[PDB]
Design a protein around this ligand. Structure first.
Ligand SMILES: CN1CCN(C(=O)Nc2ccccc2)CC1
Ligand SMILES: CN1CCN(C(=O)Nc2ccccc2)CC1
Lengths: 304, 304
């Protein structure tokens, strides 16, 4: 029993983190097989970051200008190609600790673990969500760029995020491992403002199921509702619309708890309309939206 | 920028997790050098757990009755001794992945990472605190016993917790690695009720410093207070008393922020007396007490 914001074990990813240095800029890289992945803005001075022409900047760089260090051993760079907003540095040694892996572009509302790194060294690990406005609310200081987000499926690591940017508003933007930014963000130091940070409604409902399962039940009401009724209320509170797909995904939690999904929606509606009145749910005073229904099934069943 | 509930990288600890089976009971063990540490209630049937005489139960057990599996390779048990509420199983092989380590008995209010395991396999990692009533609010299902709490100091892992018990109230009790329970708890299935779960006041203040540092400032008031005045208010709200030691520990955050510790106390006093009025601080609607001042210095400085 008990319900925690829980990251995946980071060890498989620790074993992939390296330091990448280009001139004066040092940041993190991901060593998988004989390729090191890192943000292409490694080739930028902070001055460059105002109006960087990455192709032009790259002409001046050789393989020997990219210093790649895995612990205290240097990796030889034998090639590099810019793929979108990532550099792929080919090195002459395959990472002996390469786990089984995929690159997956996640959808907004999807959760993942971040291993925050500095100089190719892990500082810590925490569970995030891709917000509906394609930002993440990370913890990232200077040197954290190249820090990655991942999921683990038994022994396969699916890398979904590489950290690139902090917006002037202190939220974070980055890419998939093909170097495509999530949302409208670019690796430029400029006015980029995130859209509305909506609540991930399906994740809130899953978390309400996790609460009931762990004994926090005070918020269960006598009411039900409909998707359309629920959604009129959701929208007014900057919650994402709930779809039949969302209802289908919550099915198992519904079955296990014997609480219909629309009944729970109607519990959630009253919480929105009436607030918590100083009460808490799994030790939170607001409605948590960074657990997916899969996260809730996983942690309430003990998947390893 | 940004502030996250952040666990240590779990990889050094992943490499120590094994499965221990005695008859029908399977749970987790910690393999360091040629010793595997696990909860002594591995020798108990759920029936035993009502009124277990561990010495008597142990007479009937041989080295060959303790099945120790590290991945899919069995470890030979060549000896075992009961030390308090832990079994130490001597095995003929030293764990090749043994990191630098200590056993440290932590104080209440101290934070640590848990690597939740099932059958010697890590499921996830999360940051806890030892509550002032010596419970932790964990996430632990059947088979999680032997899951450990730790801190990392660069490359040294200080193991502080081994998980043993869930109280009837769904909070967790366990031991240091010498097998001494934190607080008044025993490995018996009975009426054990935790005391008052007080708020770790020094941790709240550190978190208020982390907020200011990350730009959340709305709660900064024009007032100051004194330790005695603050404490009259603290006590009424089931906050731990604040001591000069606590003030001394907050010194660096005070220096960095230029907010005197007693000024921040007086901000915290108004928060207690006036609530949040529907506002949030680092995306929380209550006052977080599971970051130590050291945690706040660490994450705001990027220690690896
Ligand atoms: C911008 N360019 C792109 C091409 N390029 C390479 O090095 N390519 C390469 C890739 C894999 C192995 C060997 C060489 C130089 C920089
Ligand atoms: C309860 N007893 C305690 C003694 N004991 C041992 O095996 N001790 C041992 C320790 C280290 C190496 C070899 C033997 C049996 C069970």
């Amino acid at each position: 029993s008990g319900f925690r914001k829980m990251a995946f074990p980071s060890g498989k990813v620790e074993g992939c983190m390296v330091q990448v240095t280009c001139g004066t800029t040092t940041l993190n890289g991901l060593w998988l097989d004989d390729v090191v992945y890192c943000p292409r803005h490694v080739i930028c001075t902070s001055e460059d970051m105002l109006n960087p022409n990455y192709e032009d900047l790259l002409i001046r760089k050789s393989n020997h200008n990219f210093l790649v260090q895995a612990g205290n051993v240097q990796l030889r760079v034998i090639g590099h190609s810019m793929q979108n907003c990532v550099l792929k540095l080919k090195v002459d040694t395959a990472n002996p600790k390469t786990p089984k892996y995929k690159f997956v572009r996640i959808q907004p509302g999807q959760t993942f673990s971040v291993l925050a790194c500095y100089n190719g060294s892990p500082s810590g690990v925490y569970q995030c969500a891709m917000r509906p406005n394609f930002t993440i609310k990370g913890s990232f200081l200077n040197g954290s760029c190249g820090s990655v987000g991942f999921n683990i499926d038994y022994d396969c690591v699916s890398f979904c995020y590489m950290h690139h940017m902090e917006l002037p508003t202190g939220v974070h933007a980055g890419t998939d491992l093909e170097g495509n930014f999530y949302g409208p963000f670019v690796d430029r130091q400029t006015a980029q403002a995130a859209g509305t940070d909506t609540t991930i409604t399906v994740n809130v409902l899953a978390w309400l199921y996790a609460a009931v399962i762990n004994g926090d039940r005070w918020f269960l009401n006598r009411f039900t509702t409909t998707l359309n009724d629920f959604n009129l209320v959701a929208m007014k509170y900057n919650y994402e619309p709930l779809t039949q797909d969302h209802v289908d995904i919550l099915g198992p939690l519904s079955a296990q708890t014997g609480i219909a999904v629309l009944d729970m929606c109607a519990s959630l509606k009253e919480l929105l309309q009436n607030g918590m009145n100083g009460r808490t749910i799994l030790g939170s005073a607001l409605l948590e939206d960074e657990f997916t229904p899969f996260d809730v099934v996983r942690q309430c069943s003990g998947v390893t």
